[PDB]
Structure 1
Amino acid sequence: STHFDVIVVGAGSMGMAAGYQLAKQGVKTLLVDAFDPPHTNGSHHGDTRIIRHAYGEGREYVPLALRSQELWYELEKETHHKIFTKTGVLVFGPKGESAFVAETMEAAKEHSLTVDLLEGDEINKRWPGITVPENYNAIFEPNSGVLFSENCIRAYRELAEARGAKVLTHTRVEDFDISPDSVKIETANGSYTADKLIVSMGAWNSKLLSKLNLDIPLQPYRQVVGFFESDESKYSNDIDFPGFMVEVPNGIYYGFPSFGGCGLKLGYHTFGQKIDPDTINREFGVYPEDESNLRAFLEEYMPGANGELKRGAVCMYTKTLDEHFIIDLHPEHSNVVIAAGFSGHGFKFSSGVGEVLSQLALTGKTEHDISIFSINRPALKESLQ
C-alpha cells in the first residue's frame, strides 16, 4: 500500500549516505537492509577508516575525496556522534619501487595538496615508533585522517529518519522487477514500489546483480584487521602518530594510531581469501595468516606496536577487475542506479557517493565527473545475460 519516490537496497556505507541526501531534499525514501546498519556483516565495521586526499590509486579520485572530506566536516557539525579525527596520513615505500607512493606524490602536486616529503631516517625521527630502511621515502598528508565509519552510518541514518526516510531492517531483497516508469523489489516481508532504485548491496552485489540482467566480474574478499597492545608514548593519536597506508616488498598495509589506548590497528591490503558473503567465516584467527601477516609487518616497521592481540575483526572487500568503483545508471534502465565494487577503498568517498547517487536517481545525471566509474568501461568486462 506504500509507494516511495526512491528505494535504496542495501543501506550501508553508500546506501545510507544516499538516503540522507535524498531525505534532506524531501524525497520520500525507503532504505532496505538485510541487517540493521551499522552492523558487522558487511564492509563498514572495525570502527575506523582512513580518508586520504592525495590518492595513490589514481589522481582522478582527488576531487571526490576533497568533496567527501567537506561533507564529513558537515556531518560532524550535524550529529553528536564523533565523525572525523585529523591524524594525517603517512604513505611510504621503497624509493623508486612503489607505483602507489609515486602516484600519491603526483596526485598531491597535480592538485596542489599540502604534503611533507621525507625519507630514510627523517621518517623514523619524526615519528618515534616507525623503523624503515634508509632507502624508503614518504609523503605525509597532514590534513587527511580517520573516519569513525559505524558512527558515520549511524549519524546518516538518524538524520535521514528524522527527515522521514523509512528503514526496513533484517529484510533481504531477493529479486527486482524493473519497468520503464517504475521499480519494484521483492522480499520475504513484502514487496515495494517506487520511481527510482538505488542498488548498493556491497559484497552481495556479486551475487544479486544477475537479478538485474547484469554480468559483471565482482570478487568478494575476506579481509581482517587486528588491534595490538602498543607503546602509547609512540603510537597514540594523542602524540600524533599518523594513520598510514604503505607499500613494502610483499604488499600494501594500512593502519591507525591507538585511540584512547585501544591499540594500533593494522590490516594487510593486497591479500585476502576469496569468499562468498553468505559463507565467509567472520571469526578472526581461524586462518594462521590472519595474525601472522600482521605481526610480520609490525615486528619489522613498527616494533613497539607488536604486543598482545586486543581485538580482531573480519570484513569484506568487493573487487572489480581494475579496482575502480562502479557508479552509474543501469545500462538498460535509467531509473536504476548501481553502486558497486568499491574494491576495499571506498568508505572515505561514501559521503560524496551518497551525493552522486542522489543526483543520479533524481536527475539521471550528476555534477561530479564519474566517467572513471562507468559501468560500460572495457576494463570492467561488463555484460548482460
Structure 2
Amino acid sequence: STHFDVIVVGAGSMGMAAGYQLAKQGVKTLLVDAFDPPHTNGSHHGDTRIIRHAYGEGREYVPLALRSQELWYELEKETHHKIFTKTGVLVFGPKGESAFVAETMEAAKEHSLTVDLLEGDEINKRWPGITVPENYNAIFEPNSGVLFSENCIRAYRELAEARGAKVLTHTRVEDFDISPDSVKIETANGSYTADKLIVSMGAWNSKLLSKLNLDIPLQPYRQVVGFFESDESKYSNDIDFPGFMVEVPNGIYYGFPSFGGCGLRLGYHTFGQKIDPDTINREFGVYPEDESNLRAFLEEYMPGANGELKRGAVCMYTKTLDEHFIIDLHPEHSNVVIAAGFSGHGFKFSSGVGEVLSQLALTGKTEHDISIFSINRPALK
C-alpha cells in the first residue's frame, strides 16, 4: 500500500545524497539498502576521503568538485557530525614522468585554482616526513582536504529522515518492473512502487543493471587501506601534514594525515584484485600484497609513518573502461536514473552528484551539461 514519489535503490554515497536532496524539497522518498548505511560492505568506509579540485580527468569535473566542496561546507553547518577538515592536498611525482601530475598542473592553471608549486628538496623541507628524489615535482592545493565519508552519509540520512524520507534497511532489491508511468522494485521484504527510480548500488551495479536490460562493462576491484602508527611530529594533521595523492614507479598511492594521533592511512590506487561484491574477501591481510604494497611506499617515501599496522579496511571500486562515471537517465526509460562506475574517485563529488540525480529524477534534466557521464558514450563499450 506504499507508493512513493521516488525510490532510491542503494542508499550509499550517491543515493543518500540524492535522498537528502529530494526529501529537502518535500519529495516523498523511499531509500532501500542491502545493509544499514554507513556500513563496511560497500565503497564508502575506511573513514576518510580525499577531495581535491585540480581535476585533470576532464574539465567538467572542476565545477562539480567546487560545487561539491561548497555543498560539503553547507552540510558541515547543518549537522553535528564532522564533515570536512581542510588538510590541503599534495600531488607529487617524477618530473616529466607523470601524466597525472602534469594533468593536475594544467587543470589548476586552466581553472585558475590557488595552488603551490614545489620541487625536489623543497617538498621535504616543507613537510618533513616526506622523502622524495630531487627529480620529483609537486602541486599542493591549500584549500582542499579530507572528507569523513561515513559521517557524511549518516548526516545526509538523519537530515533526510527528519524531512520524511523512509529508509528500508537490510533489504536487497532483486528485480525491477518499469512502465512508462511507474517503477517497481521487488525485494524479500515486499514490493514498492513509485513515479521515479534512482539506481545507485555501487559495486552491485555490475551484477544488477542487467535487470534493467543494460549491458555495461563494470569491473569491481578489491581495494585495501591500512592505518599505521606514525611519528606524530611529522604526520599529524595538527602539524599540517597534507592529504595526498601521488605517483611513484610502481603506481599511484593516496593517503591521509594522522587525526587525533590515530595513525597515517594509506591506500594503493592503481592495483586491486578483480572481485565480485558478493564473494569479496573483506579481511585485510589475506593476501600478502595488502600490507606489503603499502609498506613498500612507506619505507621509501614516508619512513616515519611505517609503524605497526593498527587496522586495515577492505573496500571496493567499480570501474568503467574509460574510468569516467555514468550519470544519466536510462536510455529506454526517462523515469529511471542511473549512477554507477565511480571508478575509485567518486566520493568527493557525492554531494554534487546527489544534486544532479535529484534533478534528473524530478525533471529528466540537470542545469549543466554532464555529457562526459553519458550512458550512451561509446568508450563505455
Q: TM-score range by the shorter chain?
A: over 0.9
In structure 2, C-alpha distance between the alignment counterparts of 1:353 and 1:278, rounded to whole Å: 26
For 1:114 and 1:309, locate their aligned partners in 2 and report how far apart those are by CA, in whole Å: 35
Tell me how far apart the structure 1 counterparts of residues 111 and 221 of structure 2 sit (CA, whole Å): 32
Q: Deviations over 1:239-264 (max 9, x none)?
A: 00000000011100000000001100
- Displacement of 1:133 in angstroms is 0.3
1:191-232 per-position Cα deviation (integer Å, ceiling 9, x unaligned): 000000000000000000000000000000000000001100
Give the distance between the partners of 1:6 and 1:379, measured in 2 at CA. 30
* Displacement after TM superposition at 1:280 (Å): 0.2
- State the number of aligned residues: 381
SS in 2 for 1:101: helix
1:150 partner SS: helix
Question: What secondary structure is seen at the aligned counterpart in 1 of 2:103?
Answer: helix
Measure the CA separation in 2 of the matches of 1:320 and 1:210: 15
CA distance in 2, matches of 1:241, 1:34: 37
Distance 2:60 2:81 in 1: 31
Deviation for aligned residue 1:55: 1.1
Indicate conservation of the 8 Å contact 1:203/1:318, yes or no. yes
1:195, 1:58 → 2: CA distance?
Answer: 33
Aligned partners of 1:350, 1:2: CA distance in 2, in Å? 28
Q: Secondary structure at 1:92's aligned position in 2? A: strand
Deviations along 1:326-354, whole A, 9 cap, x unmatched? Answer: 00000000000000000000000000000
Structure 1 CA distance, aligned partners of 2:72 and 2:7? 24
Helix, strand or coil at the partner of 2:4: strand
Indicate conservation of the 8 Å contact 1:59/1:103, yes or no: no
Please name the residue that 1:251 is paired with.
251
User: 2:67 & 2:87 partners in 1: Cα distance?
Assistant: 19
The root-mean-square deviation of aligned C-alpha atoms, in Å, is: 0.5
Whole-Å separation in 2 of the counterparts to 1:321 and 1:368: 24
Contact 1:59–1:104 (8 Å) recurs in 2 = no
Contact 1:320 1:343 in 2 (8 A): yes
Say if 1:5 and 1:27, in contact at 8 Å, map to a contact too. Answer: yes
**CA–CA separation in structure 1 for the residues paired with 2:199 and 2:158:** 21
Regions of 4+ moved over 2 Å: 56-60
- Corresponding residue for residue 234 of structure 2: 234
Task: Give CA-to-partner distance per residue, 1:153-196, whole Å, 9 cap, x none.
Answer: 00000000000000000000000000001000000000000000
Q: 3-state DSSP class of the match of 2:282?
A: coil
Q: Deviations over 1:39-76 (max 9, x none)?
A: 00000000000000001333331010000000000000
CA contact (8 A) 1:35 1:171 kept: yes
Cα distance in 2 for residues equivalent to 1:97 and 1:292: 24
Contact 1:58 1:103 in 2 (8 A): no
Q: State the identity %.
A: 100
- Say if 1:235 and 1:258, in contact at 8 Å, map to a contact too: yes
Residue 368 of structure 1 and its aligned partner are, at CA, apart by 2.5
Q: Is the 8 A contact 2:60 2:370 kept in 1?
A: no
Kept in 1, the 8 Å contact 2:88–2:141? The answer is: yes
Distance of 1:277 and 1:161 partners within structure 2 = 28
CA contact (8 A) 1:325 1:342 kept: yes
| Cα deviation, residue 234, structure 1 | 0.4
* Structure 1 residues 59 and 134, CA gap change in structure 2 (3 angstroms): farther
Whether the 8 Å CA contact 1:90–1:244 is kept in 2: the answer is yes
What displacement does 1:129 show? 0.3
Give, in whole Å, the separation in 2 of the partners of 1:252 and 1:55.
15
1:22-47 Cα deviation digits (max 9, x unpaired) = 00000000000000000000000000
Structure 2 residue runs without a partner (length 5+): none
CA distance in 1, matches of 2:376, 2:125: 48
Shift, 1:101, TM fit? 0.4
Deviations 1:63-110 (A, max 9, x none): 100000000000000000000000000000000111100111111111
